[PDB]
Every structure is written in C-alpha cells, then in structure tokens.
Design a protein around this ligand. Structure first.
Ligand SMILES: Nc1ncnc2c1ncn2[C@@H]1O[C@H](COP(=O)(O)OP(=O)(O)OP(O)(O)=S)[C@@H](O)[C@H]1O
Ligand SMILES: Nc1ncnc2c1ncn2[C@@H]1O[C@H](COP(=O)(O)OP(=O)(O)OP(O)(O)=S)[C@@H](O)[C@H]1O
Ligand SMILES: Nc1ncnc2c1ncn2[C@@H]1O[C@H](COP(=O)(O)OP(=O)(O)OP(O)(O)=S)[C@@H](O)[C@H]1O
Ligand SMILES: Nc1ncnc2c1ncn2[C@@H]1O[C@H](COP(=O)(O)OP(=O)(O)OP(O)(O)=S)[C@@H](O)[C@H]1O
Ligand SMILES: [Mg+2]
Ligand SMILES: [Mg+2]
Ligand SMILES: [Mg+2]
Ligand SMILES: [Mg+2]
Lengths: 623, 140, 206
C-alpha cells in the first residue's frame, strides 16, 4: 500500500485510533450494504463537522473487533488522498497510468476497500462539475464500478449528493446512501470527556464537567450556524488557549540556561577526573532540576463558566446579561429586548417573537422557510429597526442581512444607475455570484426586499418555490434550500402626517388600496403583514433620550460627559415635531446643533464632567 | 453661510466628534455659474489638501448619454457600467481615498441616479461591477 | 533553509534585529491563536506603513526572549519571498515541484513556520484575482491547510481581506484575523528616538 494513502486497518490493529462513541447502528448498518453481491457502494450523507469520518474509523475498529458479519472479515480499508493524487506524478498521462495501476493493485481478493472524503473531487476527468476538470477515476471507474471491480465508501454532503450523484444513472444502479445526523447533548458530553485529557498539553486545568456542559449549552444557543460536535470542541480549545493568559516561560528558561552551563562545567571537570567537583555539579544540577519542576507545576487550574462566557463575547462581540439563562427565559426576555430598543408597535414584536419561538422550539413542521413577513408603512418609523436590532439579537451581529430595494433593483430606463433589461436581472440571480452564491454561504442569513410593489418585475411566482418549500432551482438546475433563512419585505401604507389624524383611518383604508397594489395571492403566501402607521409626539421623548444616550456614548471616547436639561428636551421635541413624514428631522435637529456647540467648548480648557445643556429662547447654552 | 457650514462640518470630521461609518461630507450647492460657483472647488480643495489637485469633477448632465451625437456614444445605462468595471471611477477613488468628487448640475441628465448613490450616502461602502466594495469614508 | 527566504529567528539569536516598541498586547495576542490545535492561522490586517512586519519581528524577539507560552517554544519562523519564487527556477512545472518540496521540507516537528507579506500574491495558481495567475501554493495549500500541514502568518490589508479571504470557505475554517492600528504621537516619538542614531550617516546634527 503506502502510495498516496493510508491503511486504517493497520493503525486499528495497533490500537492507535480513538474509540468511536455513540454511533452504534449507523456504523454497522453500513455492513448491511457491503455484504451484498451487487448494489454495494454506500456513501455517508450529511453536513460537515459531524464526525463524518469517525464512522469509518469506527467501522475499522469493529472489523478488528470481530463485530462485523462474516461477509467482510478478510478485508481491509485504505483511505486515499484524492486531492493530492497529481502530487505523486509529473505528467497527467503518467498520472492516469498510475491511476489504472491502482486497479491493477486492486485484485487481492477485494481485501482492499477504497475510502475517500470528496466524491465530487472524484467525479472529475470531465465536466461533471464546473467548466472542466483534470483526469481522474471517472474515465476508469464508470466501467469498473459497473463491472463490480471496486467497492468505495463515501463521502460527501447533502447538496453534493443531489446535484452530482442522482444525475448519472450508472451510479444509480450501484450506489446507496446512509443518513448521518449530529448527536444530542449527552453523547457530545461523552466525546468531550474522552478528549479531555489531550489538553494537558496546555498546562492548564483539565476541565470539570460543569464547564463542559456550560460550553455546550452556550455554543448550542449562540452559534446555530455550525454543527454541534465541532463547535463545542472549538469553543473549548479557544477557551484553553486564552486561559493560557499569555504567560511567559523565561522564569524557567533562564534556569534552563543555568543548568546547561553547569552541565558544561561538569563535563569539563569530568574530563580532568576531579570527582568532588563533578559530584558537586551533579548535586547542583539536581537542585536546579527539581526547582524547575516546582515552577512547572505552578499552573493555574481555573475552569470557570465565566471565562467561557468572555470567550464567547470575544467570538461574537455580544455581552450577555443573565448568562446561563434558560431558553424559556430568553424566548420571553427577547420580547422586551427588541421592545425596549424600539418604540411601541408591539404587534410586530408579538408576531416576530412567537414565530421565532415556534421555529426555535421546533413546533412548526419543517419543509418551510423560517419566516416570511411583510411590513408596510412610511420610512421615518424606524422602518429598518427590525433589520438592525432583530438581526443582531438573532445572530449576535447585525451583519447577517442582505437587502435589495427591489423597486430600484430592477431595470427601468437606460440611465446611468442601471444597465440592461429587467429580465437580465433574474439571470444574474440564477447564474452569478450575487444571490445564490451568498445564500448558500450563510443558509441562516436574513434577506430584506424594500418596497416591493414596485418595480417592473411582478416577481410573485418565482418566489413561490421557496415560499412553498424553500427548494428553488438556479440557472444551472441546482436547487438551493432556504430552510433556515428569513425573508422580510416592505411596502408603502400611504403616508400622512397630520400628524396622527390621518396616520390610520380604517383597516381597509389599507388592504383595499393594496389590492390593486399587492396581488391577493402574494398576500396570502405570507406568515403575516404588519404596518408602520406610527408617528406622534408624546412617545418621541423616548427616542430623544435614546439619541442623548448615543451622544454621551460618543463623547465617552474623549472622557466627556454632557448633561441635558428637560426644557432642552422639550424644545428639541418641538423642533423635530415636523410631524408630517417621519422622525429624520428629530435626529437632524441634534445632528449638528449639539456637536457644533461641543466643537467650541472643546477649544477649552474644559470641565468635561460639568457640561450641562439648557435652553435660552431656542438657543443652546452649555456650562 | 457656506463658509460657516463647511467650516463646522470640517471641524467635526477632523476632531472626530461625528460618529464614523459616514462619508466626510455630502453637500449641495444650487445657483448660477458666475458667482464663483467653483470657488469651493478650487480654494477649499487646496486649503484642505495643500493642493487644488485633489478633486475629480463630472458634469453629470453632460456626463450621461442623450442622443447619438459626436460628443457622447452609447447608452446612458452604459455609463454606470463604465463606473463599475473600468479604470474611470472605482480605480481613482481607491487611489486617493481622501479626494473630493464634484458633480455639476445634477437634475439634469437622463439618469435619475439617486438610489445608486445612497449606498455611500448611507455608509460609504459601495459595490463595483465585480462585487468588490469600495469604502468612501474619507471623501467629500 | 536559505532557499528563497530568511530565518528571522537565526538573526534574532544574533541580536541583529531592532527592538520592537509599543506593540505589547498586539504581538503576544498572536500567540493566543498559534497555541491552538486547530484554527491556528492568524493574519495581521490593516493599512500599509504601520510597522506591519515589525509585529512579527517582535514575535521572534519574544520567542528568543522566552516571553511566549510553552506551545511555541521549539519553533522558528522563516520569511519567504513569494513574489520572487519563480526567480529560483526556469520551468513552472519544476517550480511546482520545488514548491511541493517546501512541504517536503516542512516536516521538522513543525518547528518551521512560514511568513509572508502578500496573501493575495499567495492566492494564485488560479483565478482568485484578476483574469489569471501563475501556479503557486494555492493548488497545494488548499488541502495542506485543511489537513493541518502548515501554519502561516499574514499579512495584508483590509480590502484584500474582505475581497479575497472571506470568499473561500476553506480558509474560513482555518484562518483568523488580528487588527492593527497606527500608534499615537508618543510611541512614534519613542521609535524615532530609537532610530535617531542611524542618521549619523549624513554627518549632520543628530
Ligand atoms: N463519536 C466520536 N468520537 C470521537 N470523536 C468524534 C466523534 N464524532 C466526532 N468526533 C470528532 O469530530 C471530528 C469531526 O471530523 P469528521 O467530521 O469525522 O471529519 P473531519 O475531517 O474531521 O471534518 P469534517 O466534519 O469531515 S468536514 C472528528 O475528527 C473527531 O475528532
Ligand atoms: N417605533 C418606532 N417608531 C418610530 N421611530 C422609531 C421606532 N423605533 C425606532 N425608531 C427610530 O426611527 C429611526 C428611523 O430613521 P432612520 O434611522 O433614518 O431609518 P429609516 O430612514 O426609517 O429607514 P429607511 O431607509 O428610510 S426605510 C431610527 O433611528 C430608529 O431608531
Ligand atoms: N462670493 C462670490 N461671488 C461672486 N463671484 C465670486 C465670489 N467669490 C469668488 N468669485 C469669483 O467668481 C468667478 C467666477 O467665474 P469663473 O472663474 O468663470 O467660474 P465659473 O464660470 O463661475 O464656474 P462655472 O464653470 O461657470 S459653474 C471666479 O473668478 C471667482 O474668483
Ligand atoms: N515599533 C516599531 N519599532 C521600530 N520601528 C518601527 C516600529 N513600527 C514601525 N517601525 C518602522 O516602520 C516601518 C514600516 O514597515 P512595515 O509596515 O513593518 O513593513 P514594510 O515592509 O516596512 O512596509 P509596509 O508598511 O509593510 S507596506 C518598519 O520597517 C520599521 O522601520
Ligand atoms: Mg474527518
Ligand atoms: Mg426605516
Ligand atoms: Mg463657478
Ligand atoms: Mg515591513
């Protein structure tokens, strides 16, 4: 063997391989395929980071163990570096000769079984994927597998499987598939317990179970965009690395140098056969040695749930109040979390919170996207509030959304902001790294479509594919899943503002107008629609002190604190109460007026603690 | 008035009082030509940058494409293409991320380019014809 | 070593390298990435002209100094002329063979750590940028980094990072980033004071 590959069975005999835990049926079910005379090519299907190979190492372990049925007693398993095969040769014709030489080697009673990890990287030698490819097993396997020469095992992901495997009928009459799923938070705990000893390497606490389960509970709730088994491990790993606390080693390294020097002098004295001096040197060597031993055991052993927490905070940038709170706590507290960063409009909070809880708890049947909601109103209402704060709370960062203003998105007239034809636009979405690329990169992201009556395209039905089942085809026939994404789209609910006298006249004052505006079927497809009719004066002091908060936050960079009088607040409100369209002027009236005064006060010679702002006949006066 | 506004805005950006993630300044000037209409294009630019040679100006009305006449070729749509794939707009702005860009008389041509600008007008990050985003943090 | 590159640790032992000033946490924070078993490929991100390399020379200085945690005691750092690699050979097939011969050399307990200065110049061998490119580590690294063969360090700018690195998911599951910022007008004064003596060369006032 030993040619661009490794004999896993050989390592298994030596006991060099870790025990595979909790995979019982999933492994030996595999034997139920191999034991057949034909139709004997199982591939493991599932997402990455799930211990995908661990199954096959466990299979080798069982083979050595005598667990398997008699059909495969006399065989062995070799894993092959597919991607590095061209590394073993200089010329690709010589490469192909070496490849067929593998089949030449594969004649020993079938005792050799080939394993791989990238089946798409095997299906090459042609245009099975992408535009081209290098020569590989494809031009050789297609007959060999048909004529029963080889038995291969896996392995790849779900989408690779439906896009590449189910399309060649030749594989259809030889291959089979076995589902793989990430385990629950007990077996994961077991695996972590098994690994636990490895991290004696870092000379820190080998971690008590409480810290471990805490890490699991945090990674499961804060990083859903990754599989459980790998993320739980990586969190622990970075936790330990940080807990190294960047400690130096000179405090022992210096005495290592000392031991070296004393050893050299000891050798010199031994050369001159002066035994008393050499004995003294050896005694001093022992002295320094066990001193260094004492320093080495001066390691801090402190595994704390809190330290894991700050590790998380560094991971996602999100400080967590009430760390360790139950999901039951969190799913209710987020109601206020969003409620208290927005102003009123509690209906949207209610709807979004309940829908999110249903998806998170798994009550709703699958095969539907996470949520599809419509929001209809004017802009200056915090129209993008749920685009920023909801997104951040959902994903530990607001940078989990892609927004397209569909009206301006499309193509209308040959003007230098848009080029081509509106039809062309769907083409971009289905063949180019603009829409399908991204959604497959972050299958949890949120997509926002602004103001969607509204442009040339009446794209209702093209969306229905996801709006039904989340599976939607590209310009190449590949289907992309939209299971874990959120779609939010916006529209116009009319506009006032007089201010609140015409903010909302009646319920059908909206839908009946939107009937010629939004097609009733496209309405009926949504989980819900919510409106932005909200623009008043009494509730706008709250946004006032919100901006005052951010102002003082900004000032905190220069150690400056500003105090604002209530009368100043009242005057600012009255200034910004151009209550005709929205709250942009409400920000605008302090957008520069406060900071313009701060500019001149900063020329001081300034008591940053003392700055208090009040009002003199509409003029800002700060002391 | 223009002196007051420009000076205060410049001081705010220079002192770092204003929160980031916004371009340095975005201002409109509306009037006739013979008023020193380009005064702030020359003297302001030079004082800002130790040289007036820190500005690129496009007269957007004449910039675009209107009729097949021998001063302009193609389609007005084509124009946005130049801006997003060719060494005419993105090349330069990434070369001098502090430069000043001037757009003359902008009702005014075929393109109603309001929203394409909003990307910078919101956050200064704007995509090219290849998907690369260019920052406009330090420009006027 | 000494093949299209330089051992910075060797110079560090000799005391031939200037002391790196004012970069304290930013350097040893880097160790907090290297000490991990996986996810151990830090790159320094920031604009040019900020002492970008000075961080890695300071890292070598600390390694010699015994400042680092125990994880990286026995390693050394080699900087590589990526841009001049094709200068060392006549034929690009021979070039690729020499490139893989580097991995062949990279088996000595991982004591060798590769450093570069133009990651976009590394991400070649294909159409990662521009229209085309010459063969390079790309066609070899993509597995090697996935299979944990190498540990590389930086380095590049902000826009290079978002345009090239965040687009290949393979790098996403191996790489990490460390922010770099220019210091204030006190540390700069210190660095200038340090350099000050060099300009005795010009026979004018120090
Ligand atoms: N039952 C288990 N017992 C021990 N370790 C496990 C078990 N399941 C998963 N792991 C670990 O989780 C890792 C996940 O790797 P695998 O999924 O098998 O393949 P990989 O090459 O490590 O990365 P992927 O997930 O295949 S892309 C394994 O390498 C193990 O270290
Ligand atoms: N319930 C609410 N009613 C009104 N305004 C709110 C509410 N909640 C938050 N806001 C604020 O409303 C402001 C809206 O102004 P912007 O920040 O300019 O967003 P926007 O302009 O509405 O979004 P677009 O692009 O115009 S649709 C935000 O600053 C929010 O903080
Ligand atoms: N406040 C001002 N009012 C009027 N003119 C001024 C003022 N300040 C400066 N000027 C002068 O106005 C003149 C304007 O004439 P030009 O130099 O031809 O510029 P311009 O023609 O206005 O620019 P365009 O291309 O026509 S928009 C300049 O020479 C300035 O020196
Ligand atoms: N802390 C420091 N101590 C001493 N010199 C420094 C320090 N920081 C920066 N420098 C100097 O500033 C120069 C800036 O170079 P670097 O940024 O490290 O890389 P470069 O090759 O010199 O050019 P760049 O900036 O990387 S494009 C260094 O070469 C040093 O001469
Ligand atoms: Mg594996
Ligand atoms: Mg809004
Ligand atoms: Mg003028
Ligand atoms: Mg340098």
């Amino acid at each position: 063997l030993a040619k661009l590959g490794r004999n896993l069975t050989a390592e298994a005999r030596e006991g060099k391989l870790d025990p595979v835990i909790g995979r019982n049926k999933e492994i030996q079910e595999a034997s139920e395929i191999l034991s057949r005379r034909t139709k004997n090519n199982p591939v493991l299907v599932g997402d990455a980071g799930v211990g995908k190979t661990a199954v096959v190492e466990g299979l080798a372990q069982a083979i050595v163990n005598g667990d398997v049925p008699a059909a495969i007693k006399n065989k062995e398993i070799v894993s092959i570096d597919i991607s590095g095969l061209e590394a073993g040769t200089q010329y690709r014709g010589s490469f192909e000769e070496n490849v067929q030489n593998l089949v030449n080697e594969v004649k020993e009673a079938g005792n050799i079984i080939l394993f791989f990890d990238a089946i798409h990287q095997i299906l090459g030698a042609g245009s099975t994927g992408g535009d081209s490819g290098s020569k590989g097993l494809a031009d050789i396997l297609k007959p060999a597998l048909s004529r029963g020469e080889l038995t291969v095992i896996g392995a790849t992901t779900q989408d690779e499987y439906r896009n590449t495997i189910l399309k060649n009928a030749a594989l259809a009459r030889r291959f089979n598939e076995v589902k793989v799923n990430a385990p629950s938070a007990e077996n994961t705990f077991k695996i972590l317990q098994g690994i636990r000893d490895l991290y004696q390497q870092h000379h820190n606490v080998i971690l008590p179970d409480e810290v471990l389960k805490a890490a699991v509970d945090y990674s499961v709730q804060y990083i859903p965009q990754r599989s459980l088994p790998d993320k739980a491990i990586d969190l622990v790993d970075v936790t330990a690395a940080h807990l190294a606390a960047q400690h130096p080693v000179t405090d022992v390294h210096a005495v290592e140098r000392e031991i070296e020097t004393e050893k050299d002098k000891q050798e010199k004295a031994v050369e001159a056969e002066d035994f008393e001096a050499a004995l003294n040197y050896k005694t001093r060597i022992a002295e320094l040695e066990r001193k260094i031993e004492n320093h080495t055991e001066d390691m801090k052993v402190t595994a704390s749930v809190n330290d894991v927490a700050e590790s998380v905070e560094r991971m996602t940038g999100i400080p967590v109040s009430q760390m360790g709170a139950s999901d039951i706590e969190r799913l209710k507290d987020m109601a206020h979390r969003l409620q208290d960063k927005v102003i009123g409009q509690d209906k949207a909070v209610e709807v979004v919170a309940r829908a999110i809880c249903r998806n998170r708890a798994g009550f709703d049947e699958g095969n539907r996207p996470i949520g599809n909601f419509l929001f209809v109103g004017s802009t200056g209402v915090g129209k993008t509030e749920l685009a920023k704060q909801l997104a951040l709370d959902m994903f530990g960062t607001q940078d989990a959304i892609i927004r397209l203003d569909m009206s301006e998105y499309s193509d209308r007239t040959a003007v230098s902001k848009l080029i081509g034809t509106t039809a062309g636009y769907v083409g971009y979405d289905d063949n180019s790294n603009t829409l399908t690329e991204r959604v497959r990169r972050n299958p949890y992201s949120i997509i926002l479509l602004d103001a969607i009556e509204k442009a040339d395209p009446q794209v209702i039905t093209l969306l229905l594919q996801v709006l039904d089942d989340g599976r939607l085809t590209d310009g190449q026939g590949n289907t992309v899943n939209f299971k874990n994404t959120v779609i939010i789209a916006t529209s116009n609910a009319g506009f006032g503002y007089e201010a609140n006298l015409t903010e909302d006249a009646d319920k059908p004052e909206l839908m009946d107008r939107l009937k010629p505006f939004f097609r009733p079927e496209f309405l009926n497809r949504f989980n819900a629609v919510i409106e932005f009719s909200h623009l008043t004066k009494e509730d706008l002091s709250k946004i006032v002190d919100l901006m005052l908060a951010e102002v003082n936050q900004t000032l905190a960079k220069k150690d400056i604190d500003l105090v604002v009088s209530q009368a100043a607040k009242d005057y600012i409100t009255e200034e910004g109460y151009d209550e005709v369209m929205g709250v942009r002027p409400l920000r605008r009236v302090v957008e520069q007026e406060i900071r313009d005064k701060v500019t001149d006060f900063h020329l001081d010679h300034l008591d940053a603690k003392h700055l208090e702002a009040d009002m003199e006949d509409g003029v800002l006066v700060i002391r």
